[PDB]
Amino acid sequence: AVQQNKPTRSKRGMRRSHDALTAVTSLSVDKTSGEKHLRHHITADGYYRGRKVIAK
Amino acid sequence: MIGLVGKKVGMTRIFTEDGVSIPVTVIEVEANRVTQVKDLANDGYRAIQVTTGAKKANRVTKPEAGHFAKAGVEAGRGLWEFRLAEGEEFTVGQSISVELFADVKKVDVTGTSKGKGFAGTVKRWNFRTQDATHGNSLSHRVPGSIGQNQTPGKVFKGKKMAGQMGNERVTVQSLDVVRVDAERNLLLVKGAVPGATGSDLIVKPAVKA
């Protein structure tokens, strides 16, 4: 549409506050390496239950 | 009298001897395992907690499980409750099943509602879609104006607009039991049951005078 007046700065903050980036609930490191992890995914060197991923 | 928690399981057009078929919906009646019978010993509160079924149930909470523990001890699908009348129930092995529907002519059916995703604008309320020719301005489908003017300066309550289903209850009301079938333990109803297949239902003896 359009708008009535220039809006207050407290309004801008409320509208983007719930859309703000959400917690990871801490992180993981491996049972099986001195490699650091990403949780319930596999690392760049393939360590989780071995095999291999990301041969880049 | 109480209800029977079913499963929507089966749909059949079945034949009769005169060459006429009946579209029917087929519900396996499972037996009730009673839990405790909550009664007015404690407060004025009176109702019966029943589990007609089981689950694999490897992640279930201790608070669900102790209801099944005092129960028929079957790692239950879930808790259904019914108000009661005409004295307390017997708390173990009652097993109300197909014998309930031998004299029930018509049943109500009280679902677990209907599970149709979005519903929303035009589809849920069956309105028209605005003409799709005449070169209408950003419009091959539109619901139509929802209020009037400044004179009231509002939108009245209960108007049909947008939104999801929200999975409430749904009573279809008064559809005929066609047959009840012992040993196979199937209740054939003449009308439809709410939701997709593999969902739960209440199939209860009719509520209305």
Binding site: L38, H40, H41, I42, T43, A44, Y47, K52, V53, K56 | -
Partner: protein, 127 residues
């Protein structure tokens, strides 16, 4: 709504699905090992395993058959000659999908596809 379904449609029309899946199913049979998007890796898994099934015992009538469903000369050579006797000892689960992590170029969620009996590999990186 979409109740009582399975599988996935991804990013474009059926001529696109056939030609992308023909690119990728030909790349798998030469390289053994791929990385792709998660939705996409499942559909890739689902295209190649039944072909593997058909090719599980060597057989000319099933090789004529295979040429009729998949008229590609790479896919039918890798089946039967190299890959029939490899998978002769399996009944399903000829390949696995590995949930590999997020994409660096944007953030896209990925999964890797890796033949079942693929088993010697380096654990070092390359650039």
């Amino acid at each position: 709504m979409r109740h009582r379904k399975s599988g996935r449609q991804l990013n474009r029309n059926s001529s696109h699905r056939q030609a992308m899946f023909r690119n990728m199913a030909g790349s798998l049979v030469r390289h053994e090992i791929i990385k792709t998007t998660l939705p996409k890796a499942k559909e890739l898994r689902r295209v190649v395993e039944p072909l593997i099934t058909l090719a599980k015992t060597d057989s000319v009538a099933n090789r004529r058959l295979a040429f009729a469903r998949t008229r590609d000369n790479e896919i039918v050579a890798k089946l039967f000659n190299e890959l029939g006797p490899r998978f002769a000892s399996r009944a399903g689960g000829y390949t696995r999908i590995l949930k590999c992590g997020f994409r660096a170029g944007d953030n896209a969620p990925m999964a890797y596809i890796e033949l079942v009996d693929r088993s010697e590999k380096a654990e070092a990186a390359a650039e």
